[PDB]
């Protein structure tokens with residue numbers, strides 16, 4: 001059975017208990033913490049490509065009001081995010097299972113841009129999600145996995161200083 005686990009869940013949970021925030025810039029900003037995934041149960045000899053996207057966790061705009069994040073009352077349908085392909089894609093199952101799959105090079109932006117960067121809407125809440133896509137073989141297959149521990153609100157600057165302190169303490 002294909003097993004997908006979050007590496008460093010301990011640390012993600014400290015960010016999540018504060019409400020996590022991720023900076024977005026026009027040029028694109030790398031994530032801290034980095035999403036790292038433990039994968040087992042792939043066919044070592046099969047070909048797989050790891051895809052990352054961001055699900056809009058709700059349809060609301062969030063605001064930091066007197067020390068607390070609060071959702072607006074005017075939901076809108078959220079256009080789904082673009083997909084980031086892990087640099088090692090495509091690769092053998094053995095490659096992916098020999099160490100945690102680390103999405104250290106994804107950049108989050110607020111502007112439609114050349115390539116690489118993933119555009120998110122500022123002040124929306126996102127849940128990272130991966131797709132493991134068996135490629136090249138006869139039978140294409142996709143396995144998807146959500147990481148609730150890694151939820152964050154996309155921000156142009158940190159609102160909660162407790163997040164700012166944690167980001168620095170652990171980077």
Ligand SMILES: NC(=O)N1CCN(C(=O)c2ccco2)CC1
Pocket residue numbers: 049085089090133135
């Ligand atoms: N350099 C490229 O044009 N890419 C082509 C698509 N790649 C994939 O591994 C993949 C599998 C499923 C969807 O994409 C990554 C490399």
